[PDB]
Amino acid sequence: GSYEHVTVIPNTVGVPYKTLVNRPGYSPMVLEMELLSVTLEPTLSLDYITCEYKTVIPSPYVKCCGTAECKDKNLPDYSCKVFTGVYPFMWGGAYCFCDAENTQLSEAHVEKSESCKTEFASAYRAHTASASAKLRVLYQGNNITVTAYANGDHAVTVKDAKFIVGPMSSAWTPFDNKIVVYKGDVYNMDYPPFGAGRPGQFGDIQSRTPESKDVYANTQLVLQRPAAGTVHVPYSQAPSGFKYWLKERGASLQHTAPFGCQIATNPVRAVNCAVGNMPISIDIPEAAFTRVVDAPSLTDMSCEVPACTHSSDFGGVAIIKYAASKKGKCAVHSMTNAVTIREAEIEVEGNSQLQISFSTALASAEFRVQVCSTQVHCAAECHP
Amino acid sequence: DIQLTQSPSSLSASVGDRVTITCRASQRISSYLNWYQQKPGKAPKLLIYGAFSLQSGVPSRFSGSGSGTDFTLTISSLQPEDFATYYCQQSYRTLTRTFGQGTKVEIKRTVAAPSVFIFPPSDEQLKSGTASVVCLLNNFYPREAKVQWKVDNALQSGNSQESVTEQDSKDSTYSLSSTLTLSKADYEKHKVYACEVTHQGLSSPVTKSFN
Amino acid sequence: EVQLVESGGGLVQPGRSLRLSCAASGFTFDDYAMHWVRQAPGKGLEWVSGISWNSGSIGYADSVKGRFTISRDNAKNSLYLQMNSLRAEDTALYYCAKDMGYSGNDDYYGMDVWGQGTTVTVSSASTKGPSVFPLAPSSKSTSGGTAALGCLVKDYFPEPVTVSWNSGALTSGVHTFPAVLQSSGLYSLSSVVTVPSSSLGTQTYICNVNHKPSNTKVDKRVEP
Amino acid sequence: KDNFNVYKATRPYLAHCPDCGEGHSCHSPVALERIRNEATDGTLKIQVSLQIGIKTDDSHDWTKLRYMDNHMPADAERAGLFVRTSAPCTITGTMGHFILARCPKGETLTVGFTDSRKISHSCTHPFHHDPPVIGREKFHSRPQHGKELPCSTYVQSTAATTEEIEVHMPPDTPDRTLMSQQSGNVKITVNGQTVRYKCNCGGSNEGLTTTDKVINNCKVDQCHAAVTNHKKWQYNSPLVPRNAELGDRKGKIHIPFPLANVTCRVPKARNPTVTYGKNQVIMLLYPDHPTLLSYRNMGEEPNYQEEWVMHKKEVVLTVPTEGLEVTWGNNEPYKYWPQ
Ligand SMILES: *[C@@H]1O[C@H](CO)[C@@H](O)[C@H](O)[C@H]1NC(C)=O
């Protein structure tokens, strides 16, 4: 019963295309279609989250004339050192009276900072992105919205017409296999695997989830000897890898990605870039087809062009006059590829004229347009 | 080699009163002393560690202190639940912890004289080749009762044992049972047995006897 | 939820060995040093032995230093004490206790958690049951002083003898004494009750002695 | 609010400070413990040894702070509290050990106050304070109009949170002024405090006192004394020695002014004047404040470039047939094609 029509539209946005449908035995008709939005969404699997680390140091244990023992703790990047021959002072005088064998036990460890719930970046594995598109379809004056996945195996039915979208001519994505997401920005980065990060670099402190108690850290934290009687816990530690990364992030994919892809997060997606093309197949019902003899007759038709200019816009103006004894609608299509018509169809009643804009690179412009069951020739003299 | 010494035995005080227990080492052991509280049938509970620091769950009534080499435990106001044996501890900064002998806090009461009852050996026991003479002291308040056995008006010792109950929960008194152990062969060689009881609640020593 | 549970114990002859154990729950076992403390009947607390976290250091009391061995299993969350060549002097209630540090060399801490100690008895004696020797009241001379009657429970070895009057019906005026160890190695305790002297001629008083370890029960009637 | 009793049984403390003024270190009542700068709006959260909004009588009073003064806590006016870097900072709020302030760019951070004796106390730490740029434009102040972008801030809230600092029983505090030389004897003055002492003097001269004590036949240089048996609890600062292997925790204090992600306003650069050439776009850029300019091609090779624009800069870019995308500061991106 139905007829399947196939067309291909470049993967662009905001550009209308005319689709010509001509089933044998029936009058040809033009369907107007425009691509309004294209979205590509990667599947993301979180490996870990990187955030600022907090170094936590408890009061140093000072044992007067005696040896302090060090315990092995399971805290992240735990460091412990025992120093001897120390003679610490407080504001009111020396801490110990007996200095023969004074020993100080110093400890430090690394915890997730408070900001790890607010300021953090997620390290994801990206794969098998799903492509989808939003099409505007205009048939018989009716503007409808068609949304489908551009895989070639997915379709939706709107106004009894089935729209099959895809497969895409390209499976290219702006997102690499390994990406890092921070707030509204996405970066392509070869981040280190969990359990094997590096000090001063992104991924120095890692956790699988924001609420996890399982925290990995490598800050190369080393405890140093007290400064000659000063009570404190001096140490050598690598700079936060997250802070380093934040300053060295550079431009995000929103600004660096090719094909003009717009990048957004929550969910992570690439939007409206010129990647390949999108084939479309439409199942058009028999009710949508009419014969040429079923069209209303038009008479007293003519075309004139009062003015034409050369510019990037449609500076030319072509006006087609018509008369009809009966009210009805007629399909319109150009008989040449030199000049296109913005109107897929027109409404005809009484005595009136319709205005179509056009552009050309040639000073002498000639074209013909088929209207309803007849044809009208147009010509113009164009100037700079 | 080094021992901790606490108050000689026990402290008698009423509810709402103030109790201080002193513990000292014969030689310096450490800068800190721990305190424990134990009630009969129960495990020791830590009250103070680090000399001054109270353990969680321990009321403000307990306070650590000290003077010179002698550490103290103070109870600002006795509650009915504060009657227990208290121990002091020092570590020598090693595993070899040592405890004091223990100081018991007893309930204060007025002084009452003991009721003295004497129980001669039964026929069943004498036929068993042995004899036991029991001197019973009931409902007296001072724990330090003095009881001596006499046979044929002669003083005997080293052949008897004493058992004293815990302070009564209602009358706050003590009961004492002194048992004299004799063989049948020697029991029958004597004509009179007597229990001599000396006590703070008595105007004079009381002697009970049988033939 | 923090507690210690002692196990093992019981009766052995002198020269024999006994192994004690303590289970820990509610806290991390290997984060703390632990000690064994024993309390003989009528005596204060005596420290026996102790072990640091990770078994880094072990100490013993001088009285057991060459006889006792202490060890711990941090996978089983349990503490063990192996006592060899036990002597009569080793009879005591044995407690396990948790320290507040991991090293035993910290003198700021005491032991915050104590378990429920297990009794260890060392003696060259069999589980002999008690003999009951009733103590009739001297109603002939004490009639105006209120009557005191009782029963003597003698020559039994095991500690846990239970004594009651009139099958538990008579609790008022009842005084049950702590058992005292005899030179024979056997225990002896007395139980007495104070009653109105006028009741002696109409009321029968029965001493009920229940010795669980020997499956022995003695009902003895006390009368002038 | 005044319903926070987390400081009810706690005290302020003295701690080491690397610079108390004139480049000399000391033990200071306002010593800094740490500086937190996780906020993106430039707000700093500063932790200090003194406690703000609390009186020495443990009553709440937002106009007062309490600081340690030779064993005893003492009151001071909160109005005298200041924070500065390269220039004076604006304090947004305080609670206990934590001060929230917005500081100007500088390499150091100083906090101080006027005490009960009208003596100024301060502590200076090195601190590289250089606030991050929000958006793609720089500014010295927030505009009345601009783009709304998210950034981290510290919330003006004292409500309890999950992050806490542990409070422990403090160590014995050494004090050489407890001892004085009286002829051949050493006197220990307690002044109501419990004092622990140790000496090299002959006899049993080690122990505790709550009353005046005299040690005979020796000199002060052979004795040491410290105040012990503290009643109020203290934060376990790394600058204060621990008296126990695992410490002695008595309670915990929540950290006030939690971090949150909030809407932040940034200025927009004025729109450029644009003219066109042959496959070229010409922009006249007249920003009031430093503005980032960046652009990419819409083809296979984006040729991404970026530069900072100061003032009156003329920029000419090549426009490919695929189109050129140009981002000007915090303004929406412009798209250009060949004419
Ligand atoms: C803002 O912070 C909350 C937690 O406070 C977090 O759940 C949310 O995802 C954050 N939003 C953004 C955009 O980061």
PDB file of all heavy atoms in Angstrom, chain B residues 18-21 35 47-48 51-54 58-66 71-77, chain D residues 194 229 231:
ATOM      1  N   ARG B  18      32.092  12.641 101.666  1.00  0.00           N
ATOM      2  CA  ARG B  18      33.241  12.784 100.777  1.00  0.00           C
ATOM      3  C   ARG B  18      34.333  11.774 101.105  1.00  0.00           C
ATOM      4  O   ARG B  18      34.747  11.638 102.256  1.00  0.00           O
ATOM      5  CB  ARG B  18      33.801  14.195 100.863  1.00  0.00           C
ATOM      6  CG  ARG B  18      35.000  14.481  99.974  1.00  0.00           C
ATOM      7  CD  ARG B  18      35.375  15.918 100.028  1.00  0.00           C
ATOM      8  NE  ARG B  18      36.534  16.217  99.203  1.00  0.00           N
ATOM      9  CZ  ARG B  18      37.815  16.141  99.620  1.00  0.00           C
ATOM     10  NH1 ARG B  18      38.087  15.767 100.852  1.00  0.00           N
ATOM     11  NH2 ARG B  18      38.799  16.444  98.790  1.00  0.00           N
ATOM     12  N   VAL B  19      34.791  11.059 100.086  1.00  0.00           N
ATOM     13  CA  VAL B  19      35.792  10.016 100.277  1.00  0.00           C
ATOM     14  C   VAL B  19      37.068  10.268  99.494  1.00  0.00           C
ATOM     15  O   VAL B  19      37.033  10.506  98.287  1.00  0.00           O
ATOM     16  CB  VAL B  19      35.219   8.646  99.869  1.00  0.00           C
ATOM     17  CG1 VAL B  19      36.296   7.577  99.937  1.00  0.00           C
ATOM     18  CG2 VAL B  19      34.086   8.289 100.790  1.00  0.00           C
ATOM     19  N   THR B  20      38.201  10.176 100.180  1.00  0.00           N
ATOM     20  CA  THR B  20      39.492  10.304  99.522  1.00  0.00           C
ATOM     21  C   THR B  20      40.342   9.061  99.740  1.00  0.00           C
ATOM     22  O   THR B  20      40.569   8.644 100.876  1.00  0.00           O
ATOM     23  CB  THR B  20      40.259  11.530 100.042  1.00  0.00           C
ATOM     24  OG1 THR B  20      40.447  11.405 101.456  1.00  0.00           O
ATOM     25  CG2 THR B  20      39.485  12.800  99.746  1.00  0.00           C
ATOM     26  N   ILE B  21      40.834   8.490  98.647  1.00  0.00           N
ATOM     27  CA  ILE B  21      41.700   7.319  98.705  1.00  0.00           C
ATOM     28  C   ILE B  21      43.095   7.663  98.200  1.00  0.00           C
ATOM     29  O   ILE B  21      43.255   8.171  97.091  1.00  0.00           O
ATOM     30  CB  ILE B  21      41.109   6.159  97.884  1.00  0.00           C
ATOM     31  CG1 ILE B  21      39.730   5.784  98.448  1.00  0.00           C
ATOM     32  CG2 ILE B  21      42.054   4.962  97.909  1.00  0.00           C
ATOM     33  CD1 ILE B  21      38.940   4.834  97.576  1.00  0.00           C
ATOM     34  N   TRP B  35      43.055   4.473  88.095  1.00  0.00           N
ATOM     35  CA  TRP B  35      42.156   4.010  89.151  1.00  0.00           C
ATOM     36  C   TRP B  35      41.055   3.108  88.604  1.00  0.00           C
ATOM     37  O   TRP B  35      40.443   3.413  87.577  1.00  0.00           O
ATOM     38  CB  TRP B  35      41.513   5.190  89.878  1.00  0.00           C
ATOM     39  CG  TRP B  35      42.474   5.999  90.683  1.00  0.00           C
ATOM     40  CD1 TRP B  35      43.139   7.115  90.283  1.00  0.00           C
ATOM     41  CD2 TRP B  35      42.883   5.756  92.045  1.00  0.00           C
ATOM     42  NE1 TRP B  35      43.928   7.584  91.299  1.00  0.00           N
ATOM     43  CE2 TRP B  35      43.783   6.764  92.385  1.00  0.00           C
ATOM     44  CE3 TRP B  35      42.559   4.780  92.991  1.00  0.00           C
ATOM     45  CZ2 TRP B  35      44.368   6.829  93.635  1.00  0.00           C
ATOM     46  CZ3 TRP B  35      43.145   4.847  94.243  1.00  0.00           C
ATOM     47  CH2 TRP B  35      44.025   5.845  94.557  1.00  0.00           C
ATOM     48  N   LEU B  47      38.111   3.988  85.951  1.00  0.00           N
ATOM     49  CA  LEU B  47      37.506   5.290  86.185  1.00  0.00           C
ATOM     50  C   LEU B  47      38.421   6.408  85.723  1.00  0.00           C
ATOM     51  O   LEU B  47      37.977   7.366  85.091  1.00  0.00           O
ATOM     52  CB  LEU B  47      37.201   5.497  87.673  1.00  0.00           C
ATOM     53  CG  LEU B  47      36.215   4.529  88.325  1.00  0.00           C
ATOM     54  CD1 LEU B  47      36.057   4.925  89.775  1.00  0.00           C
ATOM     55  CD2 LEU B  47      34.879   4.578  87.608  1.00  0.00           C
ATOM     56  N   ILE B  48      39.696   6.289  86.071  1.00  0.00           N
ATOM     57  CA  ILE B  48      40.679   7.312  85.747  1.00  0.00           C
ATOM     58  C   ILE B  48      41.932   6.733  85.118  1.00  0.00           C
ATOM     59  O   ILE B  48      42.498   5.759  85.613  1.00  0.00           O
ATOM     60  CB  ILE B  48      41.070   8.128  86.992  1.00  0.00           C
ATOM     61  CG1 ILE B  48      39.864   8.910  87.495  1.00  0.00           C
ATOM     62  CG2 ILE B  48      42.229   9.062  86.673  1.00  0.00           C
ATOM     63  CD1 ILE B  48      40.075   9.578  88.823  1.00  0.00           C
ATOM     64  N   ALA B  51      46.228   9.726  85.399  1.00  0.00           N
ATOM     65  CA  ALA B  51      46.127  10.412  86.690  1.00  0.00           C
ATOM     66  C   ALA B  51      44.875  11.280  86.794  1.00  0.00           C
ATOM     67  O   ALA B  51      44.197  11.267  87.822  1.00  0.00           O
ATOM     68  CB  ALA B  51      47.360  11.270  86.941  1.00  0.00           C
ATOM     69  N   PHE B  52      44.601  12.079  85.769  1.00  0.00           N
ATOM     70  CA  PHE B  52      43.540  13.076  85.863  1.00  0.00           C
ATOM     71  C   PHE B  52      42.353  12.855  84.930  1.00  0.00           C
ATOM     72  O   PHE B  52      41.335  13.535  85.062  1.00  0.00           O
ATOM     73  CB  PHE B  52      44.114  14.454  85.574  1.00  0.00           C
ATOM     74  CG  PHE B  52      45.267  14.815  86.436  1.00  0.00           C
ATOM     75  CD1 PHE B  52      46.527  14.937  85.893  1.00  0.00           C
ATOM     76  CD2 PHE B  52      45.103  15.034  87.789  1.00  0.00           C
ATOM     77  CE1 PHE B  52      47.597  15.272  86.678  1.00  0.00           C
ATOM     78  CE2 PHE B  52      46.179  15.371  88.574  1.00  0.00           C
ATOM     79  CZ  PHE B  52      47.423  15.490  88.013  1.00  0.00           C
ATOM     80  N   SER B  53      42.491  11.977  83.945  1.00  0.00           N
ATOM     81  CA  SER B  53      41.478  11.894  82.899  1.00  0.00           C
ATOM     82  C   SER B  53      40.397  10.865  83.212  1.00  0.00           C
ATOM     83  O   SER B  53      40.687   9.688  83.425  1.00  0.00           O
ATOM     84  CB  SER B  53      42.140  11.575  81.573  1.00  0.00           C
ATOM     85  OG  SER B  53      41.207  11.535  80.534  1.00  0.00           O
ATOM     86  N   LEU B  54      39.145  11.317  83.230  1.00  0.00           N
ATOM     87  CA  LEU B  54      38.013  10.426  83.469  1.00  0.00           C
ATOM     88  C   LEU B  54      37.653   9.649  82.217  1.00  0.00           C
ATOM     89  O   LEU B  54      37.689  10.188  81.109  1.00  0.00           O
ATOM     90  CB  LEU B  54      36.782  11.219  83.934  1.00  0.00           C
ATOM     91  CG  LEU B  54      36.870  11.871  85.317  1.00  0.00           C
ATOM     92  CD1 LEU B  54      35.685  12.807  85.512  1.00  0.00           C
ATOM     93  CD2 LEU B  54      36.856  10.791  86.379  1.00  0.00           C
ATOM     94  N   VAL B  58      31.863   7.776  83.159  1.00  0.00           N
ATOM     95  CA  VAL B  58      32.186   8.025  84.556  1.00  0.00           C
ATOM     96  C   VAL B  58      31.728   9.424  84.958  1.00  0.00           C
ATOM     97  O   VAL B  58      32.110  10.402  84.316  1.00  0.00           O
ATOM     98  CB  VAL B  58      33.700   7.889  84.778  1.00  0.00           C
ATOM     99  CG1 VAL B  58      34.062   8.174  86.231  1.00  0.00           C
ATOM    100  CG2 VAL B  58      34.131   6.495  84.383  1.00  0.00           C
ATOM    101  N   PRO B  59      30.910   9.543  86.007  1.00  0.00           N
ATOM    102  CA  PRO B  59      30.307  10.767  86.494  1.00  0.00           C
ATOM    103  C   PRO B  59      31.348  11.697  87.099  1.00  0.00           C
ATOM    104  O   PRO B  59      32.419  11.261  87.521  1.00  0.00           O
ATOM    105  CB  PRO B  59      29.305  10.256  87.534  1.00  0.00           C
ATOM    106  CG  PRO B  59      29.860   8.925  87.987  1.00  0.00           C
ATOM    107  CD  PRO B  59      30.559   8.348  86.774  1.00  0.00           C
ATOM    108  N   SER B  60      31.013  12.982  87.143  1.00  0.00           N
ATOM    109  CA  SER B  60      31.903  14.034  87.630  1.00  0.00           C
ATOM    110  C   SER B  60      32.203  13.895  89.114  1.00  0.00           C
ATOM    111  O   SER B  60      33.076  14.577  89.648  1.00  0.00           O
ATOM    112  CB  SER B  60      31.288  15.391  87.359  1.00  0.00           C
ATOM    113  OG  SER B  60      30.115  15.565  88.104  1.00  0.00           O
ATOM    114  N   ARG B  61      31.472  13.012  89.780  1.00  0.00           N
ATOM    115  CA  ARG B  61      31.661  12.774  91.203  1.00  0.00           C
ATOM    116  C   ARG B  61      33.085  12.313  91.481  1.00  0.00           C
ATOM    117  O   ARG B  61      33.641  12.599  92.542  1.00  0.00           O
ATOM    118  CB  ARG B  61      30.688  11.717  91.704  1.00  0.00           C
ATOM    119  CG  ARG B  61      29.228  12.104  91.604  1.00  0.00           C
ATOM    120  CD  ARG B  61      28.349  11.224  92.419  1.00  0.00           C
ATOM    121  NE  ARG B  61      28.497   9.805  92.096  1.00  0.00           N
ATOM    122  CZ  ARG B  61      27.892   9.178  91.069  1.00  0.00           C
ATOM    123  NH1 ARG B  61      27.113   9.848  90.244  1.00  0.00           N
ATOM    124  NH2 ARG B  61      28.081   7.881  90.892  1.00  0.00           N
ATOM    125  N   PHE B  62      33.671  11.588  90.530  1.00  0.00           N
ATOM    126  CA  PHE B  62      35.030  11.085  90.681  1.00  0.00           C
ATOM    127  C   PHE B  62      36.035  12.091  90.139  1.00  0.00           C
ATOM    128  O   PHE B  62      35.874  12.603  89.032  1.00  0.00           O
ATOM    129  CB  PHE B  62      35.194   9.760  89.938  1.00  0.00           C
ATOM    130  CG  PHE B  62      34.358   8.651  90.488  1.00  0.00           C
ATOM    131  CD1 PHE B  62      33.140   8.347  89.915  1.00  0.00           C
ATOM    132  CD2 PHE B  62      34.779   7.916  91.576  1.00  0.00           C
ATOM    133  CE1 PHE B  62      32.361   7.329  90.419  1.00  0.00           C
ATOM    134  CE2 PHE B  62      34.003   6.898  92.081  1.00  0.00           C
ATOM    135  CZ  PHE B  62      32.792   6.604  91.501  1.00  0.00           C
ATOM    136  N   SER B  63      37.081  12.361  90.909  1.00  0.00           N
ATOM    137  CA  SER B  63      38.111  13.297  90.479  1.00  0.00           C
ATOM    138  C   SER B  63      39.506  12.835  90.875  1.00  0.00           C
ATOM    139  O   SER B  63      39.745  12.466  92.027  1.00  0.00           O
ATOM    140  CB  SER B  63      37.838  14.664  91.074  1.00  0.00           C
ATOM    141  OG  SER B  63      38.833  15.578  90.711  1.00  0.00           O
ATOM    142  N   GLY B  64      40.427  12.855  89.916  1.00  0.00           N
ATOM    143  CA  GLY B  64      41.813  12.492  90.186  1.00  0.00           C
ATOM    144  C   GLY B  64      42.610  13.691  90.678  1.00  0.00           C
ATOM    145  O   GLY B  64      42.379  14.823  90.251  1.00  0.00           O
ATOM    146  N   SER B  65      43.572  13.430  91.553  1.00  0.00           N
ATOM    147  CA  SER B  65      44.452  14.468  92.078  1.00  0.00           C
ATOM    148  C   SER B  65      45.693  13.847  92.694  1.00  0.00           C
ATOM    149  O   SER B  65      45.978  12.668  92.482  1.00  0.00           O
ATOM    150  CB  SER B  65      43.732  15.313  93.109  1.00  0.00           C
ATOM    151  OG  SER B  65      44.492  16.443  93.442  1.00  0.00           O
ATOM    152  N   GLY B  66      46.429  14.639  93.464  1.00  0.00           N
ATOM    153  CA  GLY B  66      47.585  14.119  94.183  1.00  0.00           C
ATOM    154  C   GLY B  66      48.382  15.212  94.879  1.00  0.00           C
ATOM    155  O   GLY B  66      48.214  16.398  94.599  1.00  0.00           O
ATOM    156  N   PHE B  71      49.303   9.944  95.041  1.00  0.00           N
ATOM    157  CA  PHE B  71      48.155  10.224  94.191  1.00  0.00           C
ATOM    158  C   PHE B  71      46.873   9.986  94.962  1.00  0.00           C
ATOM    159  O   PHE B  71      46.829   9.120  95.835  1.00  0.00           O
ATOM    160  CB  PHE B  71      48.152   9.313  92.981  1.00  0.00           C
ATOM    161  CG  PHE B  71      49.169   9.613  91.925  1.00  0.00           C
ATOM    162  CD1 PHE B  71      50.433   9.054  91.984  1.00  0.00           C
ATOM    163  CD2 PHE B  71      48.855  10.433  90.857  1.00  0.00           C
ATOM    164  CE1 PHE B  71      51.361   9.312  90.999  1.00  0.00           C
ATOM    165  CE2 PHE B  71      49.782  10.691  89.872  1.00  0.00           C
ATOM    166  CZ  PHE B  71      51.036  10.130  89.944  1.00  0.00           C
ATOM    167  N   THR B  72      45.821  10.725  94.639  1.00  0.00           N
ATOM    168  CA  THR B  72      44.559  10.511  95.328  1.00  0.00           C
ATOM    169  C   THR B  72      43.373  10.347  94.381  1.00  0.00           C
ATOM    170  O   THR B  72      43.346  10.905  93.284  1.00  0.00           O
ATOM    171  CB  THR B  72      44.265  11.668  96.297  1.00  0.00           C
ATOM    172  OG1 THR B  72      44.086  12.876  95.553  1.00  0.00           O
ATOM    173  CG2 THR B  72      45.418  11.848  97.270  1.00  0.00           C
ATOM    174  N   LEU B  73      42.363   9.630  94.864  1.00  0.00           N
ATOM    175  CA  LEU B  73      41.062   9.537  94.213  1.00  0.00           C
ATOM    176  C   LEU B  73      39.998  10.134  95.117  1.00  0.00           C
ATOM    177  O   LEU B  73      39.830   9.698  96.254  1.00  0.00           O
ATOM    178  CB  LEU B  73      40.710   8.074  93.916  1.00  0.00           C
ATOM    179  CG  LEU B  73      39.258   7.795  93.476  1.00  0.00           C
ATOM    180  CD1 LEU B  73      38.997   8.438  92.131  1.00  0.00           C
ATOM    181  CD2 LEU B  73      39.040   6.292  93.407  1.00  0.00           C
ATOM    182  N   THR B  74      39.283  11.132  94.619  1.00  0.00           N
ATOM    183  CA  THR B  74      38.278  11.793  95.436  1.00  0.00           C
ATOM    184  C   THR B  74      36.874  11.599  94.893  1.00  0.00           C
ATOM    185  O   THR B  74      36.614  11.820  93.709  1.00  0.00           O
ATOM    186  CB  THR B  74      38.569  13.301  95.553  1.00  0.00           C
ATOM    187  OG1 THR B  74      39.845  13.494  96.173  1.00  0.00           O
ATOM    188  CG2 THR B  74      37.494  13.987  96.388  1.00  0.00           C
ATOM    189  N   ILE B  75      35.959  11.231  95.780  1.00  0.00           N
ATOM    190  CA  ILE B  75      34.545  11.191  95.449  1.00  0.00           C
ATOM    191  C   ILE B  75      33.857  12.345  96.164  1.00  0.00           C
ATOM    192  O   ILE B  75      33.796  12.370  97.394  1.00  0.00           O
ATOM    193  CB  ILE B  75      33.908   9.854  95.863  1.00  0.00           C
ATOM    194  CG1 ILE B  75      34.675   8.697  95.215  1.00  0.00           C
ATOM    195  CG2 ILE B  75      32.443   9.837  95.437  1.00  0.00           C
ATOM    196  CD1 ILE B  75      34.313   7.330  95.761  1.00  0.00           C
ATOM    197  N   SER B  76      33.382  13.324  95.401  1.00  0.00           N
ATOM    198  CA  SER B  76      32.873  14.557  95.995  1.00  0.00           C
ATOM    199  C   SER B  76      31.615  14.329  96.817  1.00  0.00           C
ATOM    200  O   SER B  76      31.377  15.022  97.808  1.00  0.00           O
ATOM    201  CB  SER B  76      32.585  15.571  94.909  1.00  0.00           C
ATOM    202  OG  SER B  76      31.524  15.148  94.099  1.00  0.00           O
ATOM    203  N   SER B  77      30.816  13.353  96.413  1.00  0.00           N
ATOM    204  CA  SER B  77      29.596  13.004  97.126  1.00  0.00           C
ATOM    205  C   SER B  77      29.235  11.551  96.870  1.00  0.00           C
ATOM    206  O   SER B  77      28.936  11.173  95.737  1.00  0.00           O
ATOM    207  CB  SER B  77      28.464  13.911  96.685  1.00  0.00           C
ATOM    208  OG  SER B  77      27.262  13.563  97.310  1.00  0.00           O
TER     209      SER B  77
ATOM    210  N   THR D 194      46.909  23.037  89.252  1.00  0.00           N
ATOM    211  CA  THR D 194      47.618  21.825  89.637  1.00  0.00           C
ATOM    212  C   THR D 194      48.953  21.793  88.916  1.00  0.00           C
ATOM    213  O   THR D 194      49.012  21.969  87.698  1.00  0.00           O
ATOM    214  CB  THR D 194      46.811  20.560  89.302  1.00  0.00           C
ATOM    215  OG1 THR D 194      45.542  20.608  89.969  1.00  0.00           O
ATOM    216  CG2 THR D 194      47.561  19.312  89.756  1.00  0.00           C
ATOM    217  N   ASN D 229      46.357  18.629  84.962  1.00  0.00           N
ATOM    218  CA  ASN D 229      44.979  18.487  85.421  1.00  0.00           C
ATOM    219  C   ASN D 229      44.080  19.555  84.822  1.00  0.00           C
ATOM    220  O   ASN D 229      43.320  20.213  85.533  1.00  0.00           O
ATOM    221  CB  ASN D 229      44.918  18.539  86.935  1.00  0.00           C
ATOM    222  CG  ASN D 229      43.632  18.020  87.498  1.00  0.00           C
ATOM    223  OD1 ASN D 229      42.867  17.325  86.822  1.00  0.00           O
ATOM    224  ND2 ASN D 229      43.380  18.343  88.744  1.00  0.00           N
ATOM    225  N   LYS D 231      40.989  21.246  82.860  1.00  0.00           N
ATOM    226  CA  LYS D 231      39.560  20.948  82.920  1.00  0.00           C
ATOM    227  C   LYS D 231      38.855  21.158  81.587  1.00  0.00           C
ATOM    228  O   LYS D 231      37.811  20.559  81.335  1.00  0.00           O
ATOM    229  CB  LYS D 231      38.894  21.789  84.008  1.00  0.00           C
ATOM    230  CG  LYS D 231      39.433  21.528  85.412  1.00  0.00           C
ATOM    231  CD  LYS D 231      39.104  20.113  85.881  1.00  0.00           C
ATOM    232  CE  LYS D 231      39.618  19.859  87.283  1.00  0.00           C
ATOM    233  NZ  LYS D 231      39.272  18.489  87.752  1.00  0.00           N
TER     234      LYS D 231
END
